[PDB]
Amino acid sequence: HMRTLAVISAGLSTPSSTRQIADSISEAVTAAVSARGEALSVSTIELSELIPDLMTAMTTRVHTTKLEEITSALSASDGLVVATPVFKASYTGLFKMFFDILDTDALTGMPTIIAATAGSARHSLVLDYALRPLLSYMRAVVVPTGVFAATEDFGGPEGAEFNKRIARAAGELASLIVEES
Amino acid sequence: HMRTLAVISAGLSTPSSTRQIADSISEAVTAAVSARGEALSVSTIELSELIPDLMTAMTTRVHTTKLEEITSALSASDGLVVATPVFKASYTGLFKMFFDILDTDALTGMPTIIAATAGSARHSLVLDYALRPLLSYMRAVVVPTGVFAATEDFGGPEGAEFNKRIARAAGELASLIVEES
Amino acid sequence: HMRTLAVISAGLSTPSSTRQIADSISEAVTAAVSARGEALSVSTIELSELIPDLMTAMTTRVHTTKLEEITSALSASDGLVVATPVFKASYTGLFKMFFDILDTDALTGMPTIIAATAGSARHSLVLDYALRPLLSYMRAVVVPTGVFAATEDFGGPEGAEFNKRIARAAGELASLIVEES
Amino acid sequence: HMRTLAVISAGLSTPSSTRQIADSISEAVTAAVSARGEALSVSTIELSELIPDLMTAMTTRVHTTKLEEITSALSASDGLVVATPVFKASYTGLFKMFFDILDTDALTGMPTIIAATAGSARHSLVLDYALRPLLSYMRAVVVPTGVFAATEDFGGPEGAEFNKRIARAAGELASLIVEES
């Protein structure tokens, strides 16, 4: 039935480092699901392009049609990847807002990889102290390998060890994805 | 020179529980600064009324005039009170977004009381694991007594012990406010 | 081969509320693994009875024989349950110490249920902001349903909804346990 | 009356990086209190030398005499500095245990600098997500500048910017210390 992977990116710049790693991860997840013998369809959503819809959802309990279809598709997905820039030592307000807008049971059981990017790695704990508690509150199953891209640390032993990590996170998710019947 | 107190409320409903306690706190802070012999001018900002400006700041590095004046007034204040509803077991995306929009040194040294509201008190730790790290990252000095309003727990011994707490938090802030020359 | 479940309890009092729920959970896990057609052997360790060994491990890199066998058994287990009292708004120093003493890869992939107990539920977020980050740092897979026993909230609708939760957490773990070949 | 500064170090190795920075900080605090015209008496406690007393306090509600005098001196201090190594992505079990052993009101109002050390800085958020919530729960007033020593980052622009930070944290504390009458 072709496995489905939703990806939520919350970067604001162009190019977006957030979208960069979100892509690195989703590409890796496709590679892993392929290795497990299946095809993976990845649908990415850039939150900066849902601003008016989110702004509307704040001043009107009713969601636009565009938003209603996006969250519905999300809940229907087999796997999920979420990525965010680090603003004020944590996830982005826009990022959180998207999740605020979701129904309580929107991600129950949802296999998920949490990711974040920044210059250095001093704020990498944002993964376990911010995103993890969030996806956990929503009963999603967040794989152990969280991905934190420190732009300043790409290339060399570090960079290669990092790509090794993205693959590891990808495998964990891929395994959970092909497991669902 | 009349001490100034900025108050950021992020509730969305009307009436707003968030604004309710934000008021309870600011009233208490005025009472405490009065006791220390001075007058306190409290300027409250409802974030739900800055939505278009925040939505604009997300898709344009330039802030509106209305927003530019609000953040400037904020940084100029003597004290600060921040209040938020608890969405998805943490602060509101709109709340965070407001802070994302601030300059790095916007609140350096700013005396502050962090507050949050919800039905029960099971998510009260959001004060130390969400708001505290945030205002701390911005080098603001957050008073020890954080205020968490559990609507279900108003009235009776609890309610009276709570009002006692708001006064305590108010005193801590008031002391810091009249200290600045 | 009879599935194995390790249980780490860190209570100090007798009776121990911590051991009480640790038992409630392990009993529930046995019931769930039984329903999936298998037998579950549960080995519980009371940390208060490993004090001298832990005290020794702090002043001597070498672990006692009793401790060496306990951690080895742990790593070999199919599933894990960890429970702790809430001291100073977080997990117990003794609890943490036990984990400090473990090898870096001691719990990699380990299916786990995190649990904690206290009078009220105001410190229930300790599960996602303390224990979750900890077991996650050790690459253990912590099931979504964390268990927080608020002694004051036993019995009635709450209590019955709670037992419902323990069963839910038990199922998540049981599923992961019978999955390992 | 000569201002008093208590220092709790929880390192286990010798030399202790933890004690190293704990000293760097306390030296800086003495320098700052001197600049404000006073003398600072610094009493440092190495937790690894209180192990038997802590081990005893776990299996006996009664504290040894040595421990009773140490906590009493602590509560009587004008300022406090706490430092810890990072084990399993957070503070040390021994560190926490020391605080578990304290009376609820032992540090109310206590001016404090929180510090931690590790090779890299990827776990620096432990300051705001672990130590801050802890000292805050005890109503101590933790200065904004937390100190995180990343051994790998000493020397050069970073190292010099770091020493600049320690001085900043020292000033915040020193100001609070000479303020108490």
Side-chain angles (χ1 to χ4, degrees), chain D residues 124-159:
Chain D
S124 60
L125 273 179
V126 69
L127 285 180
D128 284 333
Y129 293 118
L131 289 87
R132 197 137 215 140
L134 179 66
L135 277 292
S136 284
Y137 171 71
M138 295 192 238
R139 307 179 57 192
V141 26
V142 182
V143 297
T145 313
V147 183
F148 195 83
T151 334
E152 292 165 31
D153 299 326
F154 289 156
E158 287 196 301

PDB file of all heavy atoms in Angstrom, chain D residues 124-159:
ATOM      1  N   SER D 124      25.256  21.019  28.339  1.00  0.00           N
ATOM      2  CA  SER D 124      25.246  22.220  29.164  1.00  0.00           C
ATOM      3  C   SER D 124      23.844  22.612  29.646  1.00  0.00           C
ATOM      4  O   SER D 124      23.715  23.278  30.675  1.00  0.00           O
ATOM      5  CB  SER D 124      25.908  23.391  28.419  1.00  0.00           C
ATOM      6  OG  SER D 124      25.241  23.698  27.214  1.00  0.00           O
ATOM      7  N   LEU D 125      22.802  22.189  28.925  1.00  0.00           N
ATOM      8  CA  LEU D 125      21.421  22.509  29.308  1.00  0.00           C
ATOM      9  C   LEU D 125      21.019  21.813  30.606  1.00  0.00           C
ATOM     10  O   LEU D 125      19.921  22.019  31.132  1.00  0.00           O
ATOM     11  CB  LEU D 125      20.435  22.137  28.190  1.00  0.00           C
ATOM     12  CG  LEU D 125      20.187  23.189  27.098  1.00  0.00           C
ATOM     13  CD1 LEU D 125      19.201  22.637  26.047  1.00  0.00           C
ATOM     14  CD2 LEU D 125      19.653  24.474  27.737  1.00  0.00           C
ATOM     15  N   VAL D 126      21.913  20.988  31.125  1.00  0.00           N
ATOM     16  CA  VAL D 126      21.655  20.305  32.376  1.00  0.00           C
ATOM     17  C   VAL D 126      21.506  21.371  33.478  1.00  0.00           C
ATOM     18  O   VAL D 126      20.837  21.149  34.487  1.00  0.00           O
ATOM     19  CB  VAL D 126      22.818  19.356  32.718  1.00  0.00           C
ATOM     20  CG1 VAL D 126      24.058  20.167  33.059  1.00  0.00           C
ATOM     21  CG2 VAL D 126      22.431  18.433  33.861  1.00  0.00           C
ATOM     22  N   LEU D 127      22.129  22.528  33.270  1.00  0.00           N
ATOM     23  CA  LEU D 127      22.062  23.632  34.233  1.00  0.00           C
ATOM     24  C   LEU D 127      20.646  24.163  34.427  1.00  0.00           C
ATOM     25  O   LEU D 127      20.224  24.414  35.554  1.00  0.00           O
ATOM     26  CB  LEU D 127      22.963  24.801  33.797  1.00  0.00           C
ATOM     27  CG  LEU D 127      24.484  24.685  33.958  1.00  0.00           C
ATOM     28  CD1 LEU D 127      25.152  25.961  33.446  1.00  0.00           C
ATOM     29  CD2 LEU D 127      24.840  24.450  35.424  1.00  0.00           C
ATOM     30  N   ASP D 128      19.918  24.346  33.331  1.00  0.00           N
ATOM     31  CA  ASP D 128      18.555  24.859  33.415  1.00  0.00           C
ATOM     32  C   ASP D 128      17.461  23.799  33.530  1.00  0.00           C
ATOM     33  O   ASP D 128      16.364  24.087  34.014  1.00  0.00           O
ATOM     34  CB  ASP D 128      18.248  25.766  32.222  1.00  0.00           C
ATOM     35  CG  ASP D 128      18.885  27.133  32.355  1.00  0.00           C
ATOM     36  OD1 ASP D 128      19.111  27.569  33.513  1.00  0.00           O
ATOM     37  OD2 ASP D 128      19.142  27.774  31.309  1.00  0.00           O
ATOM     38  N   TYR D 129      17.758  22.580  33.096  1.00  0.00           N
ATOM     39  CA  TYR D 129      16.775  21.505  33.152  1.00  0.00           C
ATOM     40  C   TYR D 129      16.995  20.503  34.282  1.00  0.00           C
ATOM     41  O   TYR D 129      16.238  19.545  34.422  1.00  0.00           O
ATOM     42  CB  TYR D 129      16.727  20.781  31.803  1.00  0.00           C
ATOM     43  CG  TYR D 129      16.183  21.648  30.694  1.00  0.00           C
ATOM     44  CD1 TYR D 129      16.961  21.971  29.589  1.00  0.00           C
ATOM     45  CD2 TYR D 129      14.885  22.145  30.747  1.00  0.00           C
ATOM     46  CE1 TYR D 129      16.456  22.774  28.551  1.00  0.00           C
ATOM     47  CE2 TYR D 129      14.368  22.945  29.721  1.00  0.00           C
ATOM     48  CZ  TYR D 129      15.161  23.255  28.621  1.00  0.00           C
ATOM     49  OH  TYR D 129      14.661  24.036  27.595  1.00  0.00           O
ATOM     50  N   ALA D 130      18.022  20.723  35.095  1.00  0.00           N
ATOM     51  CA  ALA D 130      18.293  19.817  36.199  1.00  0.00           C
ATOM     52  C   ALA D 130      18.611  20.564  37.486  1.00  0.00           C
ATOM     53  O   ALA D 130      17.862  20.473  38.464  1.00  0.00           O
ATOM     54  CB  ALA D 130      19.440  18.878  35.844  1.00  0.00           C
ATOM     55  N   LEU D 131      19.713  21.306  37.490  1.00  0.00           N
ATOM     56  CA  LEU D 131      20.110  22.022  38.688  1.00  0.00           C
ATOM     57  C   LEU D 131      19.216  23.198  39.021  1.00  0.00           C
ATOM     58  O   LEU D 131      18.904  23.439  40.198  1.00  0.00           O
ATOM     59  CB  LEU D 131      21.561  22.500  38.587  1.00  0.00           C
ATOM     60  CG  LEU D 131      22.624  21.402  38.659  1.00  0.00           C
ATOM     61  CD1 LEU D 131      22.881  20.836  37.267  1.00  0.00           C
ATOM     62  CD2 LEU D 131      23.897  21.977  39.232  1.00  0.00           C
ATOM     63  N   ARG D 132      18.786  23.923  37.994  1.00  0.00           N
ATOM     64  CA  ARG D 132      17.951  25.091  38.227  1.00  0.00           C
ATOM     65  C   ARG D 132      16.633  24.688  38.860  1.00  0.00           C
ATOM     66  O   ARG D 132      16.215  25.258  39.867  1.00  0.00           O
ATOM     67  CB  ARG D 132      17.710  25.847  36.923  1.00  0.00           C
ATOM     68  CG  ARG D 132      17.219  27.268  37.145  1.00  0.00           C
ATOM     69  CD  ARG D 132      17.919  28.235  36.211  1.00  0.00           C
ATOM     70  NE  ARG D 132      18.114  29.503  36.895  1.00  0.00           N
ATOM     71  CZ  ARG D 132      19.206  30.252  36.797  1.00  0.00           C
ATOM     72  NH1 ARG D 132      20.228  29.879  36.031  1.00  0.00           N
ATOM     73  NH2 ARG D 132      19.279  31.368  37.500  1.00  0.00           N
ATOM     74  N   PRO D 133      15.953  23.696  38.276  1.00  0.00           N
ATOM     75  CA  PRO D 133      14.682  23.287  38.870  1.00  0.00           C
ATOM     76  C   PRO D 133      14.885  22.828  40.310  1.00  0.00           C
ATOM     77  O   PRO D 133      14.033  23.066  41.157  1.00  0.00           O
ATOM     78  CB  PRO D 133      14.225  22.154  37.957  1.00  0.00           C
ATOM     79  CG  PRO D 133      14.833  22.530  36.621  1.00  0.00           C
ATOM     80  CD  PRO D 133      16.215  22.964  37.023  1.00  0.00           C
ATOM     81  N   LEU D 134      16.019  22.178  40.583  1.00  0.00           N
ATOM     82  CA  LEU D 134      16.326  21.673  41.925  1.00  0.00           C
ATOM     83  C   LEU D 134      16.497  22.775  42.977  1.00  0.00           C
ATOM     84  O   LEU D 134      15.818  22.756  44.010  1.00  0.00           O
ATOM     85  CB  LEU D 134      17.593  20.816  41.896  1.00  0.00           C
ATOM     86  CG  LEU D 134      18.033  20.259  43.264  1.00  0.00           C
ATOM     87  CD1 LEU D 134      16.999  19.260  43.809  1.00  0.00           C
ATOM     88  CD2 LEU D 134      19.386  19.586  43.112  1.00  0.00           C
ATOM     89  N   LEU D 135      17.411  23.717  42.730  1.00  0.00           N
ATOM     90  CA  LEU D 135      17.641  24.813  43.671  1.00  0.00           C
ATOM     91  C   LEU D 135      16.405  25.709  43.746  1.00  0.00           C
ATOM     92  O   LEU D 135      16.135  26.342  44.775  1.00  0.00           O
ATOM     93  CB  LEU D 135      18.866  25.636  43.255  1.00  0.00           C
ATOM     94  CG  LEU D 135      20.250  25.112  43.672  1.00  0.00           C
ATOM     95  CD1 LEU D 135      20.419  25.194  45.186  1.00  0.00           C
ATOM     96  CD2 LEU D 135      20.411  23.677  43.207  1.00  0.00           C
ATOM     97  N   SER D 136      15.654  25.760  42.650  1.00  0.00           N
ATOM     98  CA  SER D 136      14.442  26.555  42.616  1.00  0.00           C
ATOM     99  C   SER D 136      13.389  25.890  43.486  1.00  0.00           C
ATOM    100  O   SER D 136      12.675  26.559  44.240  1.00  0.00           O
ATOM    101  CB  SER D 136      13.920  26.697  41.186  1.00  0.00           C
ATOM    102  OG  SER D 136      14.692  27.638  40.467  1.00  0.00           O
ATOM    103  N   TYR D 137      13.286  24.570  43.398  1.00  0.00           N
ATOM    104  CA  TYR D 137      12.307  23.879  44.212  1.00  0.00           C
ATOM    105  C   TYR D 137      12.558  24.199  45.685  1.00  0.00           C
ATOM    106  O   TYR D 137      11.626  24.232  46.496  1.00  0.00           O
ATOM    107  CB  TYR D 137      12.398  22.378  44.000  1.00  0.00           C
ATOM    108  CG  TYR D 137      11.554  21.608  44.975  1.00  0.00           C
ATOM    109  CD1 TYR D 137      10.168  21.627  44.890  1.00  0.00           C
ATOM    110  CD2 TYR D 137      12.143  20.870  45.995  1.00  0.00           C
ATOM    111  CE1 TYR D 137       9.384  20.926  45.797  1.00  0.00           C
ATOM    112  CE2 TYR D 137      11.377  20.164  46.906  1.00  0.00           C
ATOM    113  CZ  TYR D 137       9.996  20.192  46.805  1.00  0.00           C
ATOM    114  OH  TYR D 137       9.233  19.469  47.700  1.00  0.00           O
ATOM    115  N   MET D 138      13.821  24.437  46.020  1.00  0.00           N
ATOM    116  CA  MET D 138      14.193  24.751  47.386  1.00  0.00           C
ATOM    117  C   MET D 138      14.187  26.240  47.662  1.00  0.00           C
ATOM    118  O   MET D 138      14.777  26.716  48.631  1.00  0.00           O
ATOM    119  CB  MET D 138      15.548  24.141  47.696  1.00  0.00           C
ATOM    120  CG  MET D 138      15.474  22.638  47.641  1.00  0.00           C
ATOM    121  SD  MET D 138      17.001  21.766  48.344  1.00  0.00           S
ATOM    122  CE  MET D 138      17.514  20.739  46.795  1.00  0.00           C
ATOM    123  N   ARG D 139      13.499  26.969  46.798  1.00  0.00           N
ATOM    124  CA  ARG D 139      13.366  28.401  46.947  1.00  0.00           C
ATOM    125  C   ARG D 139      14.687  29.164  47.073  1.00  0.00           C
ATOM    126  O   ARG D 139      14.721  30.247  47.658  1.00  0.00           O
ATOM    127  CB  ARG D 139      12.466  28.710  48.149  1.00  0.00           C
ATOM    128  CG  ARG D 139      11.113  27.991  48.125  1.00  0.00           C
ATOM    129  CD  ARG D 139      10.300  28.328  49.375  1.00  0.00           C
ATOM    130  NE  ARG D 139      10.097  29.774  49.508  1.00  0.00           N
ATOM    131  CZ  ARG D 139       9.623  30.372  50.598  1.00  0.00           C
ATOM    132  NH1 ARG D 139       9.295  29.648  51.664  1.00  0.00           N
ATOM    133  NH2 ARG D 139       9.483  31.695  50.628  1.00  0.00           N
ATOM    134  N   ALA D 140      15.777  28.612  46.550  1.00  0.00           N
ATOM    135  CA  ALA D 140      17.038  29.342  46.599  1.00  0.00           C
ATOM    136  C   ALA D 140      16.998  30.315  45.424  1.00  0.00           C
ATOM    137  O   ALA D 140      16.317  30.065  44.429  1.00  0.00           O
ATOM    138  CB  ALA D 140      18.216  28.397  46.428  1.00  0.00           C
ATOM    139  N   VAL D 141      17.695  31.439  45.524  1.00  0.00           N
ATOM    140  CA  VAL D 141      17.712  32.344  44.390  1.00  0.00           C
ATOM    141  C   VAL D 141      18.993  32.092  43.565  1.00  0.00           C
ATOM    142  O   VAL D 141      20.100  32.475  43.952  1.00  0.00           O
ATOM    143  CB  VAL D 141      17.564  33.831  44.848  1.00  0.00           C
ATOM    144  CG1 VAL D 141      18.058  33.996  46.251  1.00  0.00           C
ATOM    145  CG2 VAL D 141      18.307  34.755  43.902  1.00  0.00           C
ATOM    146  N   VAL D 142      18.819  31.395  42.440  1.00  0.00           N
ATOM    147  CA  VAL D 142      19.913  31.048  41.531  1.00  0.00           C
ATOM    148  C   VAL D 142      20.194  32.179  40.554  1.00  0.00           C
ATOM    149  O   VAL D 142      19.326  32.549  39.769  1.00  0.00           O
ATOM    150  CB  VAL D 142      19.566  29.801  40.700  1.00  0.00           C
ATOM    151  CG1 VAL D 142      20.740  29.425  39.802  1.00  0.00           C
ATOM    152  CG2 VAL D 142      19.183  28.653  41.625  1.00  0.00           C
ATOM    153  N   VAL D 143      21.405  32.721  40.591  1.00  0.00           N
ATOM    154  CA  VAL D 143      21.759  33.821  39.704  1.00  0.00           C
ATOM    155  C   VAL D 143      21.623  33.394  38.246  1.00  0.00           C
ATOM    156  O   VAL D 143      21.805  32.226  37.913  1.00  0.00           O
ATOM    157  CB  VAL D 143      23.181  34.301  39.998  1.00  0.00           C
ATOM    158  CG1 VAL D 143      23.249  34.838  41.425  1.00  0.00           C
ATOM    159  CG2 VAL D 143      24.167  33.161  39.809  1.00  0.00           C
ATOM    160  N   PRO D 144      21.299  34.342  37.356  1.00  0.00           N
ATOM    161  CA  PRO D 144      21.121  34.062  35.927  1.00  0.00           C
ATOM    162  C   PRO D 144      22.287  33.370  35.239  1.00  0.00           C
ATOM    163  O   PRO D 144      22.087  32.434  34.458  1.00  0.00           O
ATOM    164  CB  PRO D 144      20.826  35.445  35.334  1.00  0.00           C
ATOM    165  CG  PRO D 144      20.175  36.166  36.475  1.00  0.00           C
ATOM    166  CD  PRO D 144      21.072  35.770  37.634  1.00  0.00           C
ATOM    167  N   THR D 145      23.505  33.819  35.512  1.00  0.00           N
ATOM    168  CA  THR D 145      24.652  33.203  34.864  1.00  0.00           C
ATOM    169  C   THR D 145      25.019  31.866  35.496  1.00  0.00           C
ATOM    170  O   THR D 145      25.610  31.814  36.578  1.00  0.00           O
ATOM    171  CB  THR D 145      25.903  34.107  34.910  1.00  0.00           C
ATOM    172  OG1 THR D 145      25.554  35.443  34.530  1.00  0.00           O
ATOM    173  CG2 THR D 145      26.961  33.578  33.944  1.00  0.00           C
ATOM    174  N   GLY D 146      24.643  30.785  34.823  1.00  0.00           N
ATOM    175  CA  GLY D 146      24.991  29.467  35.307  1.00  0.00           C
ATOM    176  C   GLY D 146      26.343  29.203  34.678  1.00  0.00           C
ATOM    177  O   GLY D 146      26.639  29.739  33.608  1.00  0.00           O
ATOM    178  N   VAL D 147      27.171  28.385  35.315  1.00  0.00           N
ATOM    179  CA  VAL D 147      28.490  28.102  34.759  1.00  0.00           C
ATOM    180  C   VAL D 147      28.684  26.653  34.312  1.00  0.00           C
ATOM    181  O   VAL D 147      28.607  25.726  35.124  1.00  0.00           O
ATOM    182  CB  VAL D 147      29.589  28.466  35.777  1.00  0.00           C
ATOM    183  CG1 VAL D 147      30.973  28.246  35.165  1.00  0.00           C
ATOM    184  CG2 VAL D 147      29.405  29.915  36.219  1.00  0.00           C
ATOM    185  N   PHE D 148      28.930  26.464  33.017  1.00  0.00           N
ATOM    186  CA  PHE D 148      29.155  25.124  32.485  1.00  0.00           C
ATOM    187  C   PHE D 148      30.538  25.010  31.860  1.00  0.00           C
ATOM    188  O   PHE D 148      30.773  25.515  30.765  1.00  0.00           O
ATOM    189  CB  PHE D 148      28.122  24.750  31.422  1.00  0.00           C
ATOM    190  CG  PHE D 148      28.100  23.280  31.119  1.00  0.00           C
ATOM    191  CD1 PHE D 148      27.367  22.404  31.925  1.00  0.00           C
ATOM    192  CD2 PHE D 148      28.889  22.751  30.099  1.00  0.00           C
ATOM    193  CE1 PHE D 148      27.422  21.025  31.728  1.00  0.00           C
ATOM    194  CE2 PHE D 148      28.953  21.372  29.890  1.00  0.00           C
ATOM    195  CZ  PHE D 148      28.217  20.504  30.711  1.00  0.00           C
ATOM    196  N   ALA D 149      31.442  24.322  32.550  1.00  0.00           N
ATOM    197  CA  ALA D 149      32.808  24.135  32.078  1.00  0.00           C
ATOM    198  C   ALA D 149      32.967  22.958  31.108  1.00  0.00           C
ATOM    199  O   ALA D 149      32.848  21.796  31.501  1.00  0.00           O
ATOM    200  CB  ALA D 149      33.741  23.942  33.275  1.00  0.00           C
ATOM    201  N   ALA D 150      33.222  23.257  29.841  1.00  0.00           N
ATOM    202  CA  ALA D 150      33.447  22.207  28.858  1.00  0.00           C
ATOM    203  C   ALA D 150      34.972  22.124  28.743  1.00  0.00           C
ATOM    204  O   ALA D 150      35.600  22.968  28.103  1.00  0.00           O
ATOM    205  CB  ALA D 150      32.825  22.582  27.530  1.00  0.00           C
ATOM    206  N   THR D 151      35.560  21.116  29.385  1.00  0.00           N
ATOM    207  CA  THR D 151      37.011  20.931  29.400  1.00  0.00           C
ATOM    208  C   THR D 151      37.667  21.099  28.031  1.00  0.00           C
ATOM    209  O   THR D 151      38.687  21.771  27.904  1.00  0.00           O
ATOM    210  CB  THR D 151      37.395  19.542  29.952  1.00  0.00           C
ATOM    211  OG1 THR D 151      36.368  19.060  30.828  1.00  0.00           O
ATOM    212  CG2 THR D 151      38.686  19.645  30.742  1.00  0.00           C
ATOM    213  N   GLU D 152      37.075  20.479  27.017  1.00  0.00           N
ATOM    214  CA  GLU D 152      37.581  20.550  25.654  1.00  0.00           C
ATOM    215  C   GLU D 152      37.612  21.981  25.098  1.00  0.00           C
ATOM    216  O   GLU D 152      38.333  22.265  24.140  1.00  0.00           O
ATOM    217  CB  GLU D 152      36.719  19.671  24.741  1.00  0.00           C
ATOM    218  CG  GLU D 152      36.838  18.170  24.998  1.00  0.00           C
ATOM    219  CD  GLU D 152      35.709  17.369  24.346  1.00  0.00           C
ATOM    220  OE1 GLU D 152      35.211  17.795  23.277  1.00  0.00           O
ATOM    221  OE2 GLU D 152      35.327  16.309  24.894  1.00  0.00           O
ATOM    222  N   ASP D 153      36.841  22.883  25.697  1.00  0.00           N
ATOM    223  CA  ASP D 153      36.785  24.257  25.212  1.00  0.00           C
ATOM    224  C   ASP D 153      37.569  25.305  25.997  1.00  0.00           C
ATOM    225  O   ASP D 153      37.251  26.493  25.919  1.00  0.00           O
ATOM    226  CB  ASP D 153      35.329  24.720  25.101  1.00  0.00           C
ATOM    227  CG  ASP D 153      34.517  23.878  24.134  1.00  0.00           C
ATOM    228  OD1 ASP D 153      35.090  23.408  23.127  1.00  0.00           O
ATOM    229  OD2 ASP D 153      33.300  23.701  24.368  1.00  0.00           O
ATOM    230  N   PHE D 154      38.586  24.893  26.748  1.00  0.00           N
ATOM    231  CA  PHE D 154      39.382  25.866  27.498  1.00  0.00           C
ATOM    232  C   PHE D 154      40.452  26.490  26.600  1.00  0.00           C
ATOM    233  O   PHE D 154      40.891  25.875  25.626  1.00  0.00           O
ATOM    234  CB  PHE D 154      40.059  25.213  28.706  1.00  0.00           C
ATOM    235  CG  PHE D 154      39.110  24.842  29.810  1.00  0.00           C
ATOM    236  CD1 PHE D 154      39.441  23.840  30.722  1.00  0.00           C
ATOM    237  CD2 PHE D 154      37.904  25.523  29.972  1.00  0.00           C
ATOM    238  CE1 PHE D 154      38.586  23.524  31.783  1.00  0.00           C
ATOM    239  CE2 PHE D 154      37.046  25.216  31.024  1.00  0.00           C
ATOM    240  CZ  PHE D 154      37.389  24.214  31.930  1.00  0.00           C
ATOM    241  N   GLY D 155      40.868  27.710  26.929  1.00  0.00           N
ATOM    242  CA  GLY D 155      41.885  28.376  26.134  1.00  0.00           C
ATOM    243  C   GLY D 155      41.335  29.062  24.897  1.00  0.00           C
ATOM    244  O   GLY D 155      40.250  28.725  24.417  1.00  0.00           O
ATOM    245  N   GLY D 156      42.088  30.032  24.382  1.00  0.00           N
ATOM    246  CA  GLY D 156      41.664  30.762  23.199  1.00  0.00           C
ATOM    247  C   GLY D 156      40.500  31.702  23.460  1.00  0.00           C
ATOM    248  O   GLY D 156      40.172  31.976  24.614  1.00  0.00           O
ATOM    249  N   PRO D 157      39.861  32.226  22.402  1.00  0.00           N
ATOM    250  CA  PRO D 157      38.726  33.139  22.562  1.00  0.00           C
ATOM    251  C   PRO D 157      37.662  32.546  23.487  1.00  0.00           C
ATOM    252  O   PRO D 157      37.167  33.222  24.397  1.00  0.00           O
ATOM    253  CB  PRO D 157      38.221  33.313  21.129  1.00  0.00           C
ATOM    254  CG  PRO D 157      39.469  33.226  20.331  1.00  0.00           C
ATOM    255  CD  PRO D 157      40.197  32.056  20.976  1.00  0.00           C
ATOM    256  N   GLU D 158      37.319  31.279  23.255  1.00  0.00           N
ATOM    257  CA  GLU D 158      36.322  30.606  24.076  1.00  0.00           C
ATOM    258  C   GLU D 158      36.702  30.656  25.548  1.00  0.00           C
ATOM    259  O   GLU D 158      35.946  31.171  26.370  1.00  0.00           O
ATOM    260  CB  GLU D 158      36.163  29.150  23.644  1.00  0.00           C
ATOM    261  CG  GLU D 158      35.445  28.968  22.327  1.00  0.00           C
ATOM    262  CD  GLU D 158      34.964  27.536  22.125  1.00  0.00           C
ATOM    263  OE1 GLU D 158      35.810  26.613  22.137  1.00  0.00           O
ATOM    264  OE2 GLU D 158      33.736  27.336  21.963  1.00  0.00           O
ATOM    265  N   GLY D 159      37.879  30.124  25.871  1.00  0.00           N
ATOM    266  CA  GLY D 159      38.339  30.108  27.247  1.00  0.00           C
ATOM    267  C   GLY D 159      38.308  31.468  27.919  1.00  0.00           C
ATOM    268  O   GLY D 159      37.918  31.582  29.083  1.00  0.00           O
TER     269      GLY D 159
END
